[PDB]
Subunit: 115 residues, 4 copies
């Protein structure tokens, strides 16, 4: 599992469940092509987005749909989404965990990269 | 000053100086068109981006060039940039401050919206 | 102003106003003795805590009463308070800003140390 | 496992390994009595601090030795440690995960509380 996403809710102190996540990869013409998508589980984790074969070098964008998450909880948040944009696999295959910690007017994102 | 940006460096414990910031407004065809830009000052702040007359309701993207900032310090970064996307909504007088706290493999962003 | 404290609210996207802050200095017997205190202003800032003459090298603790802040807003918090513990070191002119970004089940703190 | 601690390094994008963690519980005389301690593994996780029987109601303090972590990496950090202070189990037993994200001049902490 080369790309995993974890989302936590800083208001409730819980995993953020059922958060939609869309991954894009920059194409040769510099547009964002759709790459993979999914939603977080009851643990706040999203596994199975991609495979070692599919997850080639490139510039990837992970768009976490934080607005829909907050709206479903009856909350009007500030951001449209949380975006993480990074170059992947430039020195060979790595495993990436993108973590996001959500508040209505704030978010933090961190990456854990392992070989 | 309806829109201000502040950037902090969590490695050195200092304002993030000379960071390029580009602001875009979402156009009717869903593209991002340039709206305002600048570089943070010695205090890590970027003032004078826009005026009340031109800062209308809409979806805005603030792109902070974190990768170039880290490279100028000789520090290896993860992200290509930090992207903060939000809707500006007229509800009485409102000033927007977008703050970003930068680390090489993590960033936090928050919005301070005051009257 | 050698020591300033700033507190932000990540749920409401606002300065955290009227937050009690107590500063302690570590004494020779390893106990924490009161040094300075106050409440954040309408801008979320607490100025005038100490003077350059009295703010000597040492270990300091900044206790932010986050629990009372959240209770006054009717929001259920996790932490009893936020504690920021650091050594002040004389190395040329130095001003210390301790910033805290508050959510009910999370907080971030950073130090901005300038000349 | 009712109390677990996870620590990540925001400079390297990795688990923070071999971080010492000391847990205290407030005694009847209002002093901090030692409760449990350990160090993070290669995954940045610390398991086995306590048991369901031992982890009674009370006010607990989790002190994460961030200064030693940074010093071992040849880095001079700002904070002495990262402290998390919270009331536990007041509405019955819960499971607590305390996560900490570390930078030399900044840290974030979050709690995930499950039933
Ligand atoms: O989701 C997390 C956040 Cl927001 C902060 C911290 Cl200090 C830990 C976690 S869990 C987690 C996050 C990442 Cl990037 C990698 C792994 Cl292996 C985790 O367990
Ligand atoms: Ca390559
Ligand atoms: Ca409107
Ligand atoms: Ca000294
Ligand atoms: Ca009870």
């Amino acid at each position: 599992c080369p790309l995993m996403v974890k989302v936590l809710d800083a208001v409730r102190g819980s995993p953020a469940i059922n958060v939609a996540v869309h991954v894009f990869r920059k194409a040769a013409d510099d547009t964002w092509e759709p790459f993979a998508s999914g939603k977080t589980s009851e643990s706040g984790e999203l596994h199975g987005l991609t495979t070692e074969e599919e997850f080639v070098e490139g510039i990837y964008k992970v768009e976490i749909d934080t607005k829909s998450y907050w709206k479903a909880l009856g909350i009007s948040p500030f951001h449209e989404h949380a975006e993480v944009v990074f170059t992947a696999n430039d020195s060979g295959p790595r495993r990436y965990t993108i973590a996001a910690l959500l508040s209505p007017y704030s978010y933090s994102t961190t990456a854990v990269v392992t070989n």
